[model samples]
Target: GLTGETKIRLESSAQEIKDEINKIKANAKKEGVKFEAFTNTQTGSKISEKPEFILKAKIKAIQVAERFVKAIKEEAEKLKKSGSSGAFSAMYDLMIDVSKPLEEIGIQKMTGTVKEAAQKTPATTADGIIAIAQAMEDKLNNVNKKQHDALKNLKEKAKTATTT
Candidate 1:
């Protein structure tokens, strides 16, 4: 149940990230601003040039990260069936798997844009900069919660495995 519930939460967070991204894009359109997209290698060999697209891909990485958990869970089940003793190792490996995407899409980047939107130009947008700032803040909050829960779950499973 911990595995499934954590997997679902991670999956749900992906959708929330997508909604926040769409809201960010709408805020950009309604306010008539670029929303300041950045280029990065998270998505592919070439840099992603659109802000919405970049964040969207980052969200996908979270979803992609979910698969790692599933893979970990499956490996755990395989170990169980084989009567092997690698459950702890599988959990350890998955915890590492979950943390790396943050480096690629990295919610900290959104936190930076929030500051950029706030003090720098709360005065500069069509709808208002603070509105955009809040939207970015929403993204940061979601990512913060998602990663925290995933790590918490990973640790719990690892601990359970160790005792059993």
Candidate 2:
């Protein structure tokens, strides 16, 4: 019974993410964010010359981030509906896995843009700018650790649940 439920939840979560990815991919064309074509842009010309494409990529990234958030919300709602804290925990862990990358990508892109701007501006010290960059890196690392631990714990729990 537990395994069946877990399978159902995992399937549902996976399907949701897949659907979001497809929707974003489809709508990306309208926004001029062609992932394949954008990826092929010349190295130095990317950030400046293809500003529209960059904006579209950012839009897609936001869409992904929002989907992850929605996944977590939906998982929570499902848990509440089923009255299964264990299932909730598993779903929450999976949600965190999906969400961390989305958040990190967003932060990575934003911080990169900020750092590029900082380089052009008359700043007091590059040290200060470097420190800000370090902070962003640290934040991303922390989220990575959180997601890893959550997934590991969830896996252990799932294994135990299945055996018992």
Candidate 3:
């Protein structure tokens, strides 16, 4: 607050601005004047049009959680279809791309189902370790971990999508 000679007042310049809103609003109401009052407000739309000055970035991050969820499911579906390791790299690339944007919008993504598959230590007949590798190799000879993980990942995101 400004003072001529007395002690400084406890009002912020911002409070001084805030003090006028109701009067202005009522005056506008009485006068049939259409006005927008902001303390510097709203998202997505603003005056000056250069959000860079506000958000401090030329391109601000935006998230429609549903869109990212759909995209995550689409990529997961593709990941699940292959049912073999050969598609791992490509599908992983797609998932990586999807999650990068997803993270920007407050999405805390798991590495889809691929990580689920990666974590598995599938058991089999014959010994424990060699048996597992051999089994997986034979399994992949024509058929998959990726789908299981991708599908589950897709599934969980389905709920997230539905809710949001």
Candidate 4:
């Protein structure tokens, strides 16, 4: 139910991100810009040096983050089976997992590029993508906050359950 709905929303957001990326690349091609090959030092994944390629890197991170969430869900299920008391941390841990990629990607760098007041240039598309990325970040954080709250009360109950 909630998990399925979250999956659907994630897919929809991913599609929107991909579409914007495609549009931006097309605009770049029309404007005669070339994207260069680059590799992510952290993930070792091949990427392009262009700004839009950074968005591509983010999409992969999002996919990995989804797997992380799924793993957490499975772990929580196992904890439930064993009547364990530490499931709250699973939810809270998700925040850190999702944030790692953003931290590595240097979001501030992208923002600085977008924030420059220089007269309109090719970055207009990059600006649009960054706007979408910001919205995506907000959506992700909102979902994480809701899940964290769902488990927050469990934190107190869990400690008591462990007290014999």
Candidate 5:
């Protein structure tokens, strides 16, 4: 089913992000910057809160947001074509409604936060990391908004849609 596939794609992309973060961590460590471990807010798992860490996080967050938006867009297309035969036209409508604002909410905040982080004063990694920590929290919130709110909405809407 399309819904099942969408979640699988989201899970896979999250793993990809983890792997890329580890790679960046190694490079940053080699350059004399370190990420002291801290509890990640969402999963309660350990991760770092350094400049490179947040930078990569937000960058990949933007990528995942686009991935999610496109996933919904394609779902709408699939529904559109399938429903050209008649039935579930509202499902297509629901997909577009979920996709459009998500593009605005998810990408805009993630990108804006990263841009602001890049503009902070002082060249020290310490100073940069301080600035990025704020971005990190906001970025995580945006990710949760995209994944939790949008996907949950899709599932609820899909249940109602199929019933009709």
Candidate 6:
């Protein structure tokens, strides 16, 4: 049972992330740059020790990451449009490099929290906990790879588009 406050905050945070990403994407479009739509995925833990709070936090963090990647892409698109394609490429590359560690940190934190909750509360089934952990790991990894590839391809396209 998530508290009303927590649920509202979670929804607000997610919406904020969505709005920011949309802003970036819209700007990129205005600049005549093409980018893949930011995909929002739901990754959550079902452990019942304060389950609602934990789940909300996890969802918020994922949204933040989603927004970050979108912002990076948008910035890259803007740079390209402004005649700084090479700079945009470098920035995009750097963003991808930096995001890997952040992603790992978030995954580690979420996994650890779920593990701790499961251990402390015998009410939560081990199998269910494990499944959630696995799903989170897989989702994060898949999303990260997809975003990285898209950004990399966009960088190349920006370079080519600008040079011509």
RMSD of each: 22.7, 20.9, 23.6, 24.0, 21.7, 21.9
Q: lDDT score, residue 64, model 3? A: 26
Superior by TM-score: candidate 5 or candidate 6: 6
lDDT of 1 by residue, 1-164 (tens): 34344455754333344343345345446644233424333334123222333344455555443443334334344444444345444543444354444444453454344445546444232234324535555554577576555445444444333322
| Candidate 3 vs. true structure, TM-score | 0.24
lDDT order, best first, reads 2, 1, 5, 6, 4, 3
How far out, in Å, is residue 55 in model 4?
1.9
Clashing residue pairs in candidate 5 are: none
lDDT tens digits by residue: candidate 2, 19-133: 5545545666686544565556546443434334444444455445444333333444454446555664464355346544544345434333333544553123333333334
Model 6 lDDT tens row, 1-164: 75355445753332344343344334545544222312112122112111222233344455555444344334534543466446644643453354444453254343334334435432123233333344335455664565455335434444333333
TM-score of 4: 0.29
Q: With candidate 6 superimposed using the best TM-score fit, by how many Å does residue 40's alpha carbon deviate from the native? A: 26
lDDT of 3 by residue, 1-164 (tens): 56432234453222232233223334445543223422243343333232222231111222222233333334444434445545545544555565554443332333343344344532111122222233323333221243233334434434333323
Number of backbone collisions per candidate: 0, 0, 1, 0, 0, 0
Best by TM-score: 2
Candidate 1 lands at a TM-score of 0.29
The weakest ten consecutive residues by lDDT in model 1 span 42-51
lDDT of each: 0.43, 0.45, 0.34, 0.39, 0.42, 0.40
Off by over 4 Å in 6: 1-50, 104-164
**Which stretches of model 2 miss by more than 4 angstroms?**
1-10, 19-43, 46-48, 99-164
lDDT of 5 at 24: 44
